Amino acid sequence: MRECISIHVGQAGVQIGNACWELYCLEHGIQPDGQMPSDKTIGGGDDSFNTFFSETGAGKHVPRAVFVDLEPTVIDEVRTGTYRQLFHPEQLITGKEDAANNYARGHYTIGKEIIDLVLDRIRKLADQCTGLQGFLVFHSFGGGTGSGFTSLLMERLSVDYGKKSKLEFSIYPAPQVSTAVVEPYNSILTTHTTLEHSDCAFMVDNEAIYDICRRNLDIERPTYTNLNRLISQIVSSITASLRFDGALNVDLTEFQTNLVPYPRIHFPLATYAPVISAEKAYHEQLSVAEITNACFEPANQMVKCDPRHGKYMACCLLYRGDVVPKDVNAAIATIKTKRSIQFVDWCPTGFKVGINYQPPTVVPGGDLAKVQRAVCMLSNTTAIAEAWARLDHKFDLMYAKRAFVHWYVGEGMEEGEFSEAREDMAALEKDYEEVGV
Amino acid sequence: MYTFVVRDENSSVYAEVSRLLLATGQWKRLRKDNPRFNLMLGERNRLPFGRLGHEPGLVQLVNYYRGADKLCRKASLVKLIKTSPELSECTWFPESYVIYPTVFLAAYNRRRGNVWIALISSEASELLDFIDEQGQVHVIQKYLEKPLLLEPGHRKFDIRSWVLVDHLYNIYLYREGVLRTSSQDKTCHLTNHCIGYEEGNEMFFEEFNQYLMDALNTTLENSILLQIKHIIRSCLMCIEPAISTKHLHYQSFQLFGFDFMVDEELKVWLIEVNGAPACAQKLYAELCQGIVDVAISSVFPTSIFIKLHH
Amino acid sequence: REIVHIQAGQCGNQIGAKFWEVISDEHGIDPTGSYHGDSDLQLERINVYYNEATGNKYVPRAILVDLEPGTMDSVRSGPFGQIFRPDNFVFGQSGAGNNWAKGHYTEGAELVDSVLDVVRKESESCDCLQGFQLTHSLGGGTGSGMGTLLISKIREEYPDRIMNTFSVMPSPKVSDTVVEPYNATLSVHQLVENTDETYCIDNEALYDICFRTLKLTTPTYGDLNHLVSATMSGVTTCLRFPGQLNADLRKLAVNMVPFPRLHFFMPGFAPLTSRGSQQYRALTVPELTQQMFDSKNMMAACDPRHGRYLTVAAIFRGRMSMKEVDEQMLNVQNKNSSYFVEWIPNNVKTAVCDIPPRGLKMSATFIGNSTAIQELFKRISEQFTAMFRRKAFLHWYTGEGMDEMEFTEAESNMNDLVSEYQQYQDA
Amino acid sequence: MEVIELNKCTSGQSFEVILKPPSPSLEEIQKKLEAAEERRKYQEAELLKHLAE
Numbered sequence A: 001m002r003e004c005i006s007i008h009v010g011q012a013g014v015q016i017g018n019a020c021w022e023l024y025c026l027e028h029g030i031q032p033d034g035q036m037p038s039d040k041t042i043g044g045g046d047d048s049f050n051t052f053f054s055e056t057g058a059g060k061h062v063p064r065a066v067f068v069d070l071e072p073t074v075i076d077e078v079r080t081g082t083y084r085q086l087f088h089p090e091q092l093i094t095g096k097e098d099a100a101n102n103y104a105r106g107h108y109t110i111g112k113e114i115i116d117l118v119l120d121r122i123r124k125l126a127d128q129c130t131g132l133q134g135f136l137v138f139h140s141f142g143g144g145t146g147s148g149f150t151s152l153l154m155e156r157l158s159v160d161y162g163k164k165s166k167l168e169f170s171i172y173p174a175p176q177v178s179t180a181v182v183e184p185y186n187s188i189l190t191t192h193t194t195l196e197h198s199d200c201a202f203m204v205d206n207e208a209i210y211d212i213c214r215r216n217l218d219i220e221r222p223t224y225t226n227l228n229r230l231i232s233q234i235v236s237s238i239t240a241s242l243r244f245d246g247a248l249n250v251d252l253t254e255f256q257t258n259l260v261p262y263p264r265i266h267f268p269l270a271t272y273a274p275v276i277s278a279e280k281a282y283h284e285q286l287s288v289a290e291i292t293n294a295c296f297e298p299a300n301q302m303v304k305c306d307p308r309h310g311k312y313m314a315c316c317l318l319y320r321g322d323v324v325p326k327d328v329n330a331a332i333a334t335i336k337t338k339r340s341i342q343f344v345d346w347c348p349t350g351f352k353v354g355i356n357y358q359p360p361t362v363v364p365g366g367d368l369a370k371v372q373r374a375v376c377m378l379s380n381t382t383a384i385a386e387a388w389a390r391l392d393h394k395f396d397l398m399y400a401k402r403a404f405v406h407w408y409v410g411e412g413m414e415e416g417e418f419s420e421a422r423e424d425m426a427a428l429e430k431d432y433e434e435v436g437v
Numbered sequence B: 001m002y003t004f005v006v007r008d009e010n011s012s013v014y015a016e017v018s019r020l021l022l023a024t025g026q027w028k029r030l031r032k033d034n035p036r037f038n039l040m041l042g043e044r045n046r047l048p049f050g051r052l053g054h055e056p057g058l059v060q061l062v063n064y065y066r067g068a069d070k071l072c073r074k075a076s077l078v079k080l081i082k083t084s085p086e087l088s089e090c091t092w093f094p095e096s097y098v099i100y101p102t103v104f105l106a107a108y109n110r111r112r113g114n115v116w117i118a119l120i121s122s123e124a125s126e127l128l129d130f131i132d133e134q135g136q137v138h139v140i141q142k143y144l145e146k147p148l149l150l151e152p153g154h155r156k157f158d159i160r161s162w163v164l165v166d167h168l169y170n171i172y173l174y175r176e177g178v179l180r181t182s183s184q185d186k187t188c189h190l191t192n193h194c195i196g197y198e199e200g201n202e203m204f205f206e207e208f209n210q211y212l213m214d215a216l217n218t219t220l221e222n223s224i225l226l227q228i229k230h231i232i233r234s235c236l237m238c239i240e241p242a243i244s245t246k247h248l249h250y251q252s253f254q255l256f257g258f259d260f261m262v263d264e265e266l267k268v269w270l271i272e273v274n275g276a277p278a279c280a281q282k283l284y285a286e287l288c289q290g291i292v293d294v295a296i297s298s299v300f301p302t303s304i305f306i307k308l309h310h
Numbered sequence C: 001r002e003i004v005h006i007q008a009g010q011c012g013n014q015i016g017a018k019f020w021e022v023i024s025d026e027h028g029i030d031p032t033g034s035y036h037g038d039s040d041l042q043l044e045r046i047n048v049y050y051n052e053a054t055g056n057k058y059v060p061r062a063i064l065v066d067l068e069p070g071t072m073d074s075v076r077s078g079p080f081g082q083i084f085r086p087d088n089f090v091f092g093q094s095g096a097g098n099n100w101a102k103g104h105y106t107e108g109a110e111l112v113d114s115v116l117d118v119v120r121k122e123s124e125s126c127d128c129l130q131g132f133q134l135t136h137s138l139g140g141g142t143g144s145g146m147g148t149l150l151i152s153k154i155r156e157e158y159p160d161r162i163m164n165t166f167s168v169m170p171s172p173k174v175s176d177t178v179v180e181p182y183n184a185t186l187s188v189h190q191l192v193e194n195t196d197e198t199y200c201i202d203n204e205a206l207y208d209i210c211f212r213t214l215k216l217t218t219p220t221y222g223d224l225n226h227l228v229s230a231t232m233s234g235v236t237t238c239l240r241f242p243g244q245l246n247a248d249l250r251k252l253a254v255n256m257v258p259f260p261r262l263h264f265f266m267p268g269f270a271p272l273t274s275r276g277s278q279q280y281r282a283l284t285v286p287e288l289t290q291q292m293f294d295s296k297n298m299m300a301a302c303d304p305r306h307g308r309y310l311t312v313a314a315i316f317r318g319r320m321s322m323k324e325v326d327e328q329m330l331n332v333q334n335k336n337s338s339y340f341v342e343w344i345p346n347n348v349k350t351a352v353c354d355i356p357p358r359g360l361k362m363s364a365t366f367i368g369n370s371t372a373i374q375e376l377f378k379r380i381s382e383q384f385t386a387m388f389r390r391k392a393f394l395h396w397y398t399g400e401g402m403d404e405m406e407f408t409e410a411e412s413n414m415n416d417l418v419s420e421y422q423q424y425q426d427a
Numbered sequence D: 001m002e003v004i005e006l007n008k009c010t011s012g013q014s015f016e017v018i019l020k021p022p023s024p025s026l027e028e029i030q031k032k033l034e035a036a037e038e039r040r041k042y043q044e045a046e047l048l049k050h051l052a053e
């Protein structure tokens, strides 16, 4: 057993982190006080769930997590929330002045003041690890902290933990729930600086999550809470292989191996099904064939885009619940005939499949119905580059007039970093294009 | 009031569609780069499909199907016909091959008509050296050595059909077609009216049907058009799963030009599919007004179209 | 994240006093500083504007300034006048005689250190100071001349804090002296360099609204200030209450100001109401949306259709469908897209707060950064030059040591501001 | 369509299916962060110098 440390940065990262850790406790039978009745390994153990939880001599299971924000408002709710006893106080790090939606304020001005403290608190968790695998980093592209501080931390993690994998769960900006007009700037700045330091990044477009909540959960105007419970279900599907017994994606290194054959194209598309409202009195349970087929519907993807017009480089299906391999292959065979699934010719046309027999767990009183079987598909498709295209365009409109650039230059950033980051993105869109035509 | 943008100024068809939209007082034209449009009459190449359908509060529609180029380029169409089980390796497409200027050894099995096109020739080398002196990809295909020839004049022709596929993937064949007549011999073998009996070298269906009853004892409908409807339906049904926008966040429609050649057994063949066609001047008003009714007003609110049922 | 509030001169202290009356009522604070409040939304961010004192009293973080004691006596005599901290009254005796030069260079200079001492005391008790907000007029002497002197000195001592102002522009329709265009032009020159954000509160618009829309035949400064206090309450909503946004002055500045000098906002309000008379039909979200964007609701006398919105911030107050709010806000942009610059994507951001203002079940407040604001500065520039070309009334200023050259520089800077706003109206 | 690498345990199973085969240092970081602080300090020194005039 090798440990994983989760790092949650800024408002989006912290609030999503809370949703995930609440769901993790429910899945593993850990109560808000951190007690786990079924762990007979008291004070320790090299069990699968110990990848994400440490144990006290007193039997408390404590997340291997650190929450960092440049203002206290959001983490203060964790300090006084349902799971406050869960986290050690040193794990919740707070500033006083946030980044003001400004990547350069998070990365240079305010970030340089708190980076050493954060890395010492991280070092403290690493020191309780017998073999550290690496990090899971949650943040927004658009926030000043989520973008600017995260990229500073990713650089230092590469220096201080050279051999360790770093994965990202990243919130791509959507106008329906965005808070700043400069989110396109912060996104390109944090993608450019972070690209080399990340081995695998799962993007979640808030536009996709929002529509899924409206369409399938009948929420008139979703809140962050609605989005984050849905997002935490997807994150839980992705990390389940790290926390449970099994033979697929058992360490962070396997995520790169299975999903990222070329290093810069390391943004797998996540597709999740079925999403069913808790309000539906009568729901006909969906079969393996139906939930699998739903994995090829753009309406169920974490990023709206069209995989029929890209090429695949890898594809994993992560099932939870009443699923047997025969139903999966039967479902795949018919789906192959009926859908446009084109692989790059230098990769085999195939699916890596993981099945966990425990069906998805749902937060009591949430919006998701309990279902008998669910699946998260992770495909590395060039189609996800549509999202880069959209963002680079918005960036280009504002930057052509240098609108708002003075707020970044005023924090000590140079204008040249904008065009350098924008050039990197240009090479990225070109990489995806060469691989996809 | 609905809004739209025009990003291909060289389109006769959608220039008339713009004029029609404005004249209803219910459509206003925005600037090319304004993204708060309902309708995009897009450019012909590198049309930015990945930026459609991400405008909250706007239902967005575009006049092209992403991926329909596979049907509308010479060498991709051959690839599609020979590799798609729906269109077997197929009684209504002339035998075709792709060759690159930097494999079709059946003329030897011919052991004897061998006219082919890119451009036309009778000897393999005469053509092969023509593709290399240009530089890009060409395709060569059997010439129709006994076409149907109109009398008087002994002339040759091709049939254009316009087909409108709406956002719901209804296939609508415009009831008016046009024959392009002809009056190293490119003068009466390549039938492009770009390359004077009937005005401008265009015989419309009413005259052509009258011909088929007088000369042959049949109708346009039985002897040719059944075959055409079958071909259109087959081609568009084959690519439907790859290009449909039924569950997409933006919707597409598109107008196609199908080019057919009729032979002497009154037997139809597919030559080309044109993805940005023009119309005969006599028919612009009607067809463009049809594009508005069937493809645009049906999204943003007797018939000149034959719905091809699938 | 504490804000320090400063109100200066006659107009500054009168609209300042109304603002503290209005938001205290919204937060459940009475004239004694005690909280008899219904909801707890009222106290969650109360520290942005209030210091807490022993015995659970709430004291405004407010400093009252004037070179003349009269209108500050009336404030202290006023309803909530007992809530202000008495040490934070800083005043002289000689007045400013409606002369920017006296407020800025001779009378105001004598008193400005005492004010900065009070500013310092309030700042040193702040956990993390956001910055400052100043209420003042630009047409008098004290708010205009000494107010901009205070801004310049506050910037020297707190260069990394945000400076925000509510600046009342003079109008001949509501005018005290002929020299208002001089005082205003000298002040704008200061505001362009030394504030991050200023709400342009145009006495012309306030007068037109009272006369035309509110059918008040003879509007008083009391009628004008009812509009001002409603606008001030609305534009502060996201600083004072918890929401999906949790705004502060720096984030407002970052998201509203694409180029540093273009930081002058047209505020708007709906429904427009006169003091004392209440109407009993609430608006529909569709009605709120149309009225808040209507030129007849702008507090700066500019036609928005003569320019383009660079950025817009909108806040809806009251129990309503946020779905309907979102649809109506998307509707106005999609139907009027030409009036929003295409080079700032999604330049309209909406916030909602459950607590409505006093007397209304629903309201909408509008904050626009429009290139049409140039009309305001053009109007003032014409009135300035009409006198300045004959050097009329200058002796009031040269008598305090000022030079004509200083008038030429300030006029030239304000003309440049007009040019820069014109530059982006066509892009 | 070939199934391979099947692993079974009491919690689930995993396997693979082939439809078809193939056809900066701590010091450099310190330098950039401190450069940006110098640009900030310079611009603030220009502001105060101009306010001193």
Ligand SMILES: Nc1nc2c(ncn2[C@@H]2O[C@H](COP(=O)(O)OP(=O)(O)OP(=O)(O)O)[C@@H](O)[C@H]2O)c(=O)[nH]1
Pocket: A009, A010, A011, A012, A013, A015, A016, A069, A070, A071, A098, A099, A100, A101, A102, A106, A139, A140, A141, A142, A143, A144, A145, A146, A147, A171, A173, A174, A177, A178, A179, A180, A183, A206, A224, A225, A227, A228, A231
């Ligand atoms: N899915 C999801 N997205 C969120 C959540 N919270 C914030 N976001 C997104 O994050 C973007 C802004 O970044 P934030 O993380 O909120 O800002 P920050 O990381 O705290 O950095 P600061 O600028 O200092 O506040 C917005 O566009 C939101 O869409 C959340 O709880 N769930």
Ligand SMILES: Nc1ncnc2c1ncn2[C@@H]1O[C@H](COP(=O)(O)OP(=O)(O)CP(=O)(O)O)[C@@H](O)[C@H]1O
Pocket: B094, B117, B141, B142, B143, B144, B145, B157, B158, B189, B190, B191, B192, B259, B261, B271, B272, B274
């Ligand atoms: N296999 C074949 N047998 C006989 N005639 C043929 C033929 N293939 C093409 N032709 C004729 O020769 C012409 C060659 O022109 P081509 O088909 O390349 O033009 P096009 O149809 O691409 C022009 P547009 O896009 O304006 O319709 C055809 O239009 C047709 O009249």
Ligand SMILES: Nc1nc2c(ncn2[C@@H]2O[C@H](COP(=O)(O)OP(=O)(O)O)[C@@H](O)[C@H]2O)c(=O)[nH]1
Pocket: C008, C009, C010, C011, C012, C014, C015, C096, C097, C098, C137, C138, C139, C140, C141, C142, C143, C144, C168, C170, C171, C174, C175, C176, C177, C180, C203, C206, C221, C222, C224, C225, C228
């Ligand atoms: N809206 C409004 N404007 C005012 C009020 N009092 C003064 N003004 C304006 O301010 C200008 C006079 O400046 P004033 O503030 O009285 O001089 P000061 O005492 O030196 O600050 C006039 O042009 C008025 O239009 C008020 O109560 N409300």
Ligand SMILES: COc1ccc(N(C)c2nc(Cl)nc3ccsc23)cc1
Pocket: A179, A180, A181, C235, C236, C238, C239, C245, C247, C248, C249, C251, C252, C253, C255, C256, C311, C312, C313, C314, C315, C346, C347, C348, C349, C350, C351
């Ligand atoms: C143009 O995009 C934006 C404009 C403004 C903002 N911010 C920071 C606001 N700050 C305050 Cl105090 N109130 C409001 C009310 C609505 S937005 C807003 C955010 C984005």
Ligand SMILES: [Ca+2]
Pocket: A039, A040, A041, A042, A044, A045, A046, A047, A050
């Ligand atoms: Ca154990």
Ligand SMILES: [Mg+2]
Pocket: A010, A011, A069, A070, A071, A074, A098, A145
């Ligand atoms: Mg935050």
Ligand SMILES: [Mg+2]
Pocket: C010, C140, C176
């Ligand atoms: Mg006065």
